[PDB]
């Protein structure tokens, strides 16, 4: 009975409500607010020729890779702005990219519905395609390297899959969302991960078990970005609703509401700081705000680009943050 | 200054930049078109006449055309529609004949309106094809008209209704400076490339005075 399903929903909602006391509106009020924070651009990468949709930092915290619709991948050197590599893609339609933790592999995909793996360290000194993971039906949305031989993907099929790169076959699938899935982020322990979907809800998953453990809700519209907390105990959610929220993975409830009246536009990406105090989030209004993690105060703002910030990432050491926009320019902020 | 290895790295970066710039200049010469039909429209017919995205490029009178038909994508289009924002023009197909299968005309009209009124994608010209002339012509005289559209109040056949539905489609074109071309195909004509060529040359001319606005 669907009425039994909604009865279970009602009783679990009642239990969650019974397990809530804060608010989170009077607590944390006594700490020293960070106030305004000044940020200044340091470098500008001007090699691309069209829109850029995704970028990722390396583990060394110096190299990064960016993807653009011109059909090319560039491996930049942030310290010197030197183009280490230029990779021509088979399909000019790309929507995501990822950097392997070991630094030997880089992956990218998009509307072609397949994920291509590129080997950087080759005997001949030129990059090559290692695997063409083609199991999904819809467009690729996000990719992440579990290790040197394990990659997770999310596509338009409302599903996610875990791959065995050398074998080239899916080993696990997730089929619970019932709605297009758009972004995902891996926990620091590399055991659990979360994904965002257009169904106005997000679900936590278990990598080994291959089954959902918790489903989060209470959000008005689509979700476009998610990222874990540094301690792997919480996460924040992007949206086209022009709002951000963060939930506790153990308490299972919404905590913060990052809403300002002056901004009514979609949110393209989010990220945290090394200590998690600073919340970063792109916007469709061409500038990305900076939010206090637990004060809900817009601490600062970053001018530019022209239009429109679509992807950003923070280094592992936290030293700097990079942002990208449809104007084919990358910037490093410190 | 900088060491020898850094100098070599800088030289390599300059070579990469030059190669990339040359590739971009070469690529920016061709014209990109998007084919966005609806359901059983004659998009397949047009593409054959010439599991994800499909690209087929052809050269006509030393002009390179790249055509895309995102038909396999079953996901919602409001996402990922923004990818084809910098496209020269788009192609739309309907029929004429089929208008009672459900109706089909209402669905096509609302889809056309939705795609023609977007926050972006607002200043791209549209090429509209009315394929399957013969089936529509045979359908009219035996089962006139009806039409599903009420308050028609016009001559029964034939160019009357043809131009009536045509005008109904050129309607709901709010923005200025953006033209809608049209042509009716019998599914056996061998001049669709000619009309596409004429439309694209007209569009590029319009773009030229646009810059020299004049607007």
């Amino acid at each position, epitope marked *: 009975l669907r009425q039994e399903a909604e009865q279970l929903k009602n009783q679990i909602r009642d239990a969650r409500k019974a397990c809530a006391d804060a608010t989170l509106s009077q607590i944390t009020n006594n700490i020293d607010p960070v106030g305004r924070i000044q940020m200044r651009t340091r470098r500008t990468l001007r090699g691309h020729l069209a829109k850029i949709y995704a970028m990722h930092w390396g583990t060394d915290s110096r*190299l990064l890779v960016s993807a653009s619709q011109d059909g090319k991948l560039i491996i930049w050197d942030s310290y010197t702005t030197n183009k280490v590599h230029a990779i021509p893609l088979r399909s000019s339609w790309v929507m995501t990219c990822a950097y392997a933790p070991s630094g030997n592999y880089v992956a990218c995909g998009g509307l072609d519905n397949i994920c291509s793996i590129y080997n950087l360290k080759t005997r*001949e000194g030129n990059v090559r395609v290692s695997r063409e993971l083609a199991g999904h039906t819809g467009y690729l949305s996000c990719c992440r390297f579990l290790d040197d031989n394990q990659i997770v993907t999310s596509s338009g099929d409302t599903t996610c899959a875990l791959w065995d790169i050398e074998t080239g076959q899916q080993t696990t699938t997730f089929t619970g969302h019932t709605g297009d899935v758009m972004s995902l982020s891996l926990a620091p322990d590399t055991r659990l991960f979360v994904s965002g979907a257009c169904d106005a809800s997000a679900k936590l998953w278990d990598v080994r078990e291959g089954m959902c453990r918790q489903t989060f809700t209470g959000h008005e519209s689509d979700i476009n970005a998610i990222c874990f907390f540094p301690n792997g105990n919480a996460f924040a959610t992007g949206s086209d609703d022009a709002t951000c929220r963060l939930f506790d993975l153990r308490a299972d409830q919404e905590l913060m509401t990052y809403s300002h009246d002056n901004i009514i536009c979609g949110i393209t990406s989010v990220s945290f700081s090394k200590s998690g105090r600073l919340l970063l989030a792109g916007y469709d209004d061409f500038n990305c705000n900076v939010w206090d993690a637990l004060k809900a105060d817009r601490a600062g703002v970053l001018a530019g680009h022209d239009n429109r910030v679509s992807c950003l990432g923070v280094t592992d050491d936290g030293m700097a943050v990079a942002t990208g926009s449809w104007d084919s320019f990358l910037k490093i902020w410190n | 200054t900088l060491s*020898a290895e850094e100098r070599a790295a800088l*030289e390599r970066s300059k070579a990469i930049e030059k190669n990339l710039k040359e590739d971009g200049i070469s690529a920016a010469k061709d014209v990109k078109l998007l084919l966005l039909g609806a359901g059983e429209s004659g998009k397949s017919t047009i593409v054959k006449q010439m599991t994800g995205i499909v690209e087929t490029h052809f050269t006509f009178k030393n002009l390179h055309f790249r055509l895309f038909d995102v038909g396999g994508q079953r996901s919602e289009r409001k996402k990922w529609i923004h990818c084809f924002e910098d496209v020269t023009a788009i192609i739309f197909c309907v029929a004429l004949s089929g208008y009672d299968q459900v109706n089909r005309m209402h669905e096509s009209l609302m889809l056309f309106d939705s795609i023609c009124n977007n926050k972006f994608f607002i200043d791209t010209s549209i090429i509209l094809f009315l394929n399957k002339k013969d089936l529509f012509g045979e359908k009219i005289k035996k089962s006139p008209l009806t039409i599903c559209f009420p308050e028609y109040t016009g001559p029964n056949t034939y160019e009357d209704a043809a131009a009536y539905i045509q005008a109904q489609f050129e309607s709901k074109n709010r923005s200025p400076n953006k033209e809608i071309y049209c042509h009716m195909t019998c599914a056996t004509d061998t001049n669709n490339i000619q009309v596409v060529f004429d439309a694209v040359t007209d569009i590029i001319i319009a773009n030229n005075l646009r810059g020299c606005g004049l607007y």
Partner: single-chain antibody
Amino acid sequence: DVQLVESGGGLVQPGGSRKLSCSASGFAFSSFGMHWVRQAPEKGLEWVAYISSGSGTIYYADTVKGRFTISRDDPKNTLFLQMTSLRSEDTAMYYCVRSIYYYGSSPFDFWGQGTTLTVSSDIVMTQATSSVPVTPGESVSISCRSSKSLLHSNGNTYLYWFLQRPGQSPQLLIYRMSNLASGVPDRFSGSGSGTAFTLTISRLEAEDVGVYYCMQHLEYPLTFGAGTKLELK
């Protein structure tokens, strides 16, 4: 796979002119900068020439300047070193090396085979002694010294180590004195100060016997050190 073959050697009277050609096969030859290295008939090693990837930069040593030129043609996959006016001491064995420069590269990784030949300031490296008695299964260290400190402002200490097995072309071991070349046992370890450097070999086997060298890449011309040969006392 990757392999360089060359055949231009011969016996020419003093001041003669010849051409040297080593043909590449098994890699993107057009994307690598190539060097030439001369091994005198008795002992020793010294840098000779260098041509960049796009032939947009060429360097020479002193004795080579004005008498030899280097050229390439990417489509044919060939490297040319022009012998002209050669003097009495020019007789030696020659190798053509491959090298690519970017962040975290491994230049001088692979060497050619060699082609014989008969006829008729700069940084200085010091090593000593040229022969030290060693036996299998016991550790050993080899030291190399320079005049100017190699520590650049970037923090990269440009020092390279090579091993030449008896009767075989050398191979790279350590680059930048802190990394390890691909396909090398982990027992090797590069360490040292800004002017003095050493090695560390553990679990020595009969395959490690040979003659080693220390080289710098900080500033041209590239200068090789003396050879320290290991034996089986």
